[PDB]
Symmetry: C2
Subunit: 288 residues, 2 copies
């Protein structure tokens, strides 16, 4: 239902204006339709719902904007000059399906279009401006793209945990923290609560990358939908490479536990029903 | 008042230096392309329209101008890439990917796109104004604007198409981000719908004209003049104005387009509190002779 509606919202954005380049629209939609867990938009919508706010088309637009930036980031991450994968979401990567130019531009479209999507909501305009500012912050030079540069620069280097945390909190952490913070902001919560939601999001965001690192070296192709073990060949700074699998599994499980405990704590202090968020977090757990 | 070019660049610099650095290499790559050069026509036109409308310039106007220049800059970085136009030179210097590497250039362009909206949301404009500016800048830049035009441009390589299809490419890849500063300044000025449409119209005329001009320069001017490799359009079999219509008719179209834009601007000056002399002088600097 949420899943279906998120994809409807994205399809609507691309199919309700007069088309300029049919090939561009097709390339953008290819990557969207290839698959994806939709964790980021789902979390935004679940927090709104948990905070007792009926979901509207505007919430789905805000959620879609977040997913659009996430999708653009994947398309560029996969490119030959970056991680160079032939597969994403169980299908050919955008650049192998089409060509590199098309993939570069499809990613660019998603980044630029995302802010138009976000600006189409019926939220109060002060809310919208804050969401735009924060989404830029999470995504750009001081967020995801900054993290991506650090990830590429760390290849083959012996970095420490602080530096590994810096990569992971930025390349992945920021865009998983944003949906928690953004939902709280739309709910117009006070500063203390906005900080607690950002904290939960930052814990989930770092844990998600620890999880992604573990899966890179433990899972098969069918399970992850991308070529396994690229992190090893590329000499990426990762949790397993720095700390080992045993510690990485412990950190993932502890982090997920902590996020859940903070969520349950909130429900003692405000009108907040986190059961769906808790269910989603449970589905992220791994077994060695 | 202040030199606009220097203030625009200082505004962009401050955006990158006012927050704790995450990747120094990224900041360096972004600023390299900004600092390489550029006429800054897009942000200058926005600022000139604000001033022509008798509005004193503020930090916020420079931020909005800077955001536009950031998107424009990101578009050049990606346009130069090996998978796209494959130029080794831009703004008289090595292109971003030849100075650094392909990955760096991809990410530098991505940064500029994503950062631009953060820049725009830093203004002190009324929030309803900012939301409209964000929506419109996305429209001008994305799948229905610049990027859409970029895809059409690559798809038309080696293809014979008509004027209609050539205009579709040009209006979207270049027209929209030259139309935006006119529309956006009128929007910040809070002009009525009719005036917003008139300013957009002026900008679309100037925007289409600027690409005709660019097409003409790519085949008539040398490397020293344009700061990029001449004649790339020819070798890659791009659809251009001189190819579709000949050089003579292309010069004629440029001149008459710039005439048309100037006429609308003069008419507005006879109707509202608007003083476009500096805009008109900028437009005159865009003229070419055979
Ligand atoms: C680890 C990161 C940040 C990239 C993959 O994210 P996901 O694992 O959420 O990818 P999809 O489900 O969207 O394919
Ligand atoms: C912005 C991104 C893609 C962060 C996750 O990095 P990875 O390169 O490990 O993600 P996957 O390709 O493994 O999904
Ligand atoms: C839209 C086009 C023709 C790309 C180059 O734009 P400019 O000719 O304005 O480039 P800079 O001055 O910014 O270098
Ligand atoms: C979005 C852009 C960059 C439009 C100009 O494309 P061109 O490829 O014609 O411009 P130059 O490289 O000649 O500046
Ligand atoms: Mg990567
Ligand atoms: Mg990757
Ligand atoms: Mg990975
Ligand atoms: Mg080009
Ligand atoms: Mg080019
Ligand atoms: Mg050109």
């Amino acid at each position: 239902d949420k899943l279906k509606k998120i994809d409807q919202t994205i399809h609507a954005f691309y199919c309700e204006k007069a088309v300029i380049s049919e090939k561009l629209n097709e390339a953008v939609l290819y990557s969207i339709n290839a698959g994806g867990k939709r964790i980021r938009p789902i979390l935004f919508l679940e927090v709104i719902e948990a905070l007792q706010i009926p979901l509207t088309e505007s919430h789905f637009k805000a959620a879609a904007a977040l997913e659009m930036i996430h999708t653009g980031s994947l398309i560029h991450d996969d490119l030959p000059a970056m991680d160079n994968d032939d597969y994403r979401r169980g299908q050919l990567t955008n650049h192998k399906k089409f060509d590199e130019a098309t993939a570069i531009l499809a990613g660019d479209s998603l980044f630029l279009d995302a802010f138009g999507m976000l600006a189409e909501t019926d939220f109060p305009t002060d809310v919208t401006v804050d969401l735009v500012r924060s989404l830029s912050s999470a995504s750009g030079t001081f967020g995801m793209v900054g993290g991506q540069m650090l990830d590429m620069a760390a290849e083959g280097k012996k970095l420490n945990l602080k530096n590994l945390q810096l990569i992971h909190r930025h390349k992945t952490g920021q865009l998983l923290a944003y949906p928690f913070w953004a939902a709280a902001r739309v709910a117009q919560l006070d500063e203390n609560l906005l900080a607690t939601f950002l904290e939960i999001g930052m814990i989930i965001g770092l844990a998600f990358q620890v999880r992604d690192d573990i899966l890179d070296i433990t899972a098969n192709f069918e399970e992850i939908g991308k070529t396994p073990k690229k992190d090893v060949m590329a000499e990426k700074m990762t949790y397993p490479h720095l700390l080992g699998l045993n510690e990485s599994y412990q950190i993932l499980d502890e982090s997920l536990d902590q996020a859940e405990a903070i969520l349950r704590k909130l429900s003692d202090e405000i009108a907040f029903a986190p059961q769906k968020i808790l269910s989603l977090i449970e589905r992220l757990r791994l077994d060695a």
